[PDB]
Design a protein around this ligand. Structure first.
Ligand SMILES: *[C@H](O)[C@H](C[C@@H]1CCNC1=O)NC(=O)[C@H](CC(C)C)NC(=O)OCc1ccccc1
Ligand SMILES: *[C@H](O)[C@H](C[C@@H]1CCNC1=O)NC(=O)[C@H](CC(C)C)NC(=O)OCc1ccccc1
Lengths: 302, 300
């Protein structure tokens, strides 16, 4: 199995650069609005302790340089929504895809289109960790790069990049500017809370193993969801939600293995280990494949 | 941070089409007025078992090829065969053709794959040409004609077209000139690859990436000569490290202050002792599908 990103072309067509003063980052151009992180309006000195409402009062439409490549897009209005700036421009992007704005849950995965100066540089799969960080790959100038999923030509944007935490993981917002997790867009000392393993995704990977014929771990036990959740937390595993049980439905049906039966199989792995054996060729339980990712890879969805 | 990252696929997405001959369907690459696709599209499901391609091709007409770009059919006005690749001349030029080149990559080099089905892009991921000329892909029925590529300043360098899956689950294909990487043939028969080896220069590049990313547990105070390292590498089915490789690792050594032969001593310890259940960049195994260039591009 490999981490497979979505094709990025529909998003590539929406990336622009936004500059204020000498601070340049990326923005997302959909119809006649450009979305970008609000700290574009900060000087380096401002970022330590910014008063964003006051900083925005000192900015006019003509203070914003928005460029598609080297081509300027005239700003005709501006507003701030939470941690994102919305710059109304005088041109509707002809490459705007069908799109939605969505707020994802921990455990969900998405493709990141890493960009610099409005120019796409690479694409990779990320998972939202339970502590609301992502283990990304971002350098200076990457803010405003977005994360997304695609379903049948509709792009669901879920992440906009804002910052790096001292442990080297990354934090950001949805496209309404609301941070994932307890982070704020100030250049202050912030720490990601203790992370946990994404149980629903480990279960998805056990189903993927079963589908490919690797099933030694299937036991003769079962469990209740509550009993499992209480034990899983003792092993630094996330508890399962009703939604998690439901999204495992299709893999459960495909393999004929009840979700709570697989939970009991995982519990044995946690209480006794792997005892030298492997699953899908690995001694470690992978937790960044969602049940959708497993079915997406085993099917030919485009 | 450090991830396996692919090139943005938009420039290639605009070139993918569907090609059908009878009941066989796969993908094609549309550049200017030509569509490139694997020649086994002309085979029936049963022809595939043992095809004679020149004999099968002379019996086809232009109208036997159905090329669809999205919903729109392109009319085939000519066809030729170049090795294992069919070149279909269409009456329409692709307005989305990027600046491009056809290249044949070297074992150990990496490229992005755009997996497609029925002419529609499905996923993108990074692959390496293994020393035994297989790739570890993720491809299903209908993925043939999917391409691999690298992108440099808006010029797309096409290096791979997908043709088949081996019994072991690894994959084989050709360059855009139709010549297979490796000793494989486009016939529906079980084929084995030569014994694979590990790409040593890539493992070292990845160890330098782990250092850049503030990880050092595997480093040591020992040192080694190039020849003494290659003796141990060969013993562990690793590829030889050349002076050219040592040179290519130069920038990464200067950035980290770790001489190449010092990183070699580190890797030799890793090979003879194992990782003892520790991990490097979240991995339990030594990763060999990042080139030195891949590490530099992502780390700087
Ligand atoms: C936006 O491009 C940038 C992305 C960072 C650059 C390095 N890797 C990244 O992901 N974001 C920032 O520079 C961000 C701006 C604040 C106003 C949110 N600041 C930041 O990430 O600082 C981290 C930091 C905090 C405290 C001390 C030292 C560094
Ligand atoms: C083209 O879409 C397809 C890609 C395969 C399909 C399964 N996964 C893939 O990557 N290629 C073929 O179907 C190919 C046809 C030519 C060799 C004529 N055949 C193939 O990959 O099967 C090889 C094989 C050998 C022995 C047993 C089973 C399969």
């Amino acid at each position: 199995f490999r981490k497979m990103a979505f094709p990025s072309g529909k998003v590539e067509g929406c990336m622009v650069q936004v500059t204020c003063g000498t601070t340049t980052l990326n923005g997302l151009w959909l119809d006649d609005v450009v979305y970008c992180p609000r700290h574009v309006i900060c000087t380096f000195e401002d970022m330590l302790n910014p008063n964003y409402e006051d900083l925005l009062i000192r900015k006019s439409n003509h203070n914003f340089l928005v460029q598609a490549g080297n081509v300027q897009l005239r700003v005709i209005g501006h507003s701030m929504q939470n941690c994102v700036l919305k710059l109304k421009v005088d041109t509707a992007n002809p490459k705007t895809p069908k799109y939605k704005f969505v707020r994802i849950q921990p455990g969900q995965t998405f493709s990141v289109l890493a960009c610099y100066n409005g120019s796409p540089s690479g694409v990779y799969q990320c998972a939202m960790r339970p502590n609301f960080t992502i283990k990304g790959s971002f350098l200076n100038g990457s803010c405003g790069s977005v994360g997304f999923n695609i379903d049948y030509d509709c792009v669901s944007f879920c992440y906009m990049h804002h910052m790096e935490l001292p442990t080297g993981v990354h934090a950001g917002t949805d496209l309404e500017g609301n941070f994932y997790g307890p982070f704020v867009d100030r250049q202050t000392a912030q720490a990601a809370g203790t992370d946990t393993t994404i149980t629903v995704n480990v279960l998805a990977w056990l189903y993927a193993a079963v589908i490919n014929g690797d099933r030694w771990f299937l036991n003769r036990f079962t469990t209740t969801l509550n009993d499992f959740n209480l034990v899983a937390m003792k092993y630094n595993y996330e508890p399962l939600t009703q939604d998690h049980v439901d999204i495992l439905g299709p893999l459960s049906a495909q393999t004929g293995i009840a979700v709570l039966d697989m939970c009991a199989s995982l519990k044995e792995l946690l209480q006794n280990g792997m005892n030298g054996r492997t699953i899908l060729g690995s001694a470690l339980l992978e937790d960044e494949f969602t049940p959708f990712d497993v079915v997406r890879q085993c099917s030919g969805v485009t």
